Chain A
């Protein structure tokens, strides 16, 4: 049976949301040994839904300027992060990650409708894939921002971020961002 990093279970992972049950891919067939797979996912549209969620996370963690190519680094970060999570909660880290993703992604968004000049945006519904992508982006950004100028490691910081977003507490950056977007989207209508 396939285990992530050769230690992490995937059959225990339970998706709470019915909306994201299709787009977070980790459960059975999509489960892989390593995050690094280096297959084309930007080949055609919606294909990055069929890409593993850990892999996606990895790919958004190397995003920044000086780190722009280094994928092995990213995967090491992810691994250590997972270990940290395990140490902390005792729960399966993949499950935690999934939870975080669920609780980080925005549900509604204010978007410019009319012309350039009319600054009254209309609050619109958010795609499930986009909600996943955006969530991932937010989490990675949080990880970055917590780990810039301190003794804290990115693996540690990322783990912290992910647990905070898993629990639903207002200590995560991602959660805060969601709250800020969501309230705005409740204001515009």
Chain B
């Protein structure tokens, strides 16, 4: 299963070298399910992602 995404907020920079962006992901499946994910590359607020696995949740706490 492939789920599409939104960007609610761009939080900060994670990763070793400062390559990964920590981003708040709203779902495009109508649900207000806000999962925080890590992205590689440039992401601005209002981007729409293609997540391969939606069950995953990135480094919270």
Contact = CB atoms under 8 A, between A and B. Distances in A.
Q: Do chains A and B touch in the complex (CB under 8 A)?
A: yes
B16 A45 contact: no
Contact of A113 (B20, B28, B51): B20
Contacts of A12: none
A62 B25 CA distance: 37
Q: Tell me what chain B mostly uses at the interface: helix, strand, loop, or mixed.
A: loop
Contacts, number: 79
Given A127-B41, A129-B42, A18 B48 contact: yes
B48 A126 contact: no
B52 to A, nearest CB: 5
Q: Could you say which interface size class chain A belongs to?
A: 20 to 34
Given A18-B4, A107-B50, A128-B49, A46 B42 contact: yes
A127 to B, nearest CB: 3
B42 A125 contact: no
B37 A125 contact: yes
A50 to B, nearest CB: 13
A109 B15 CA distance: 13
Contacts of B47: 22, 127-128
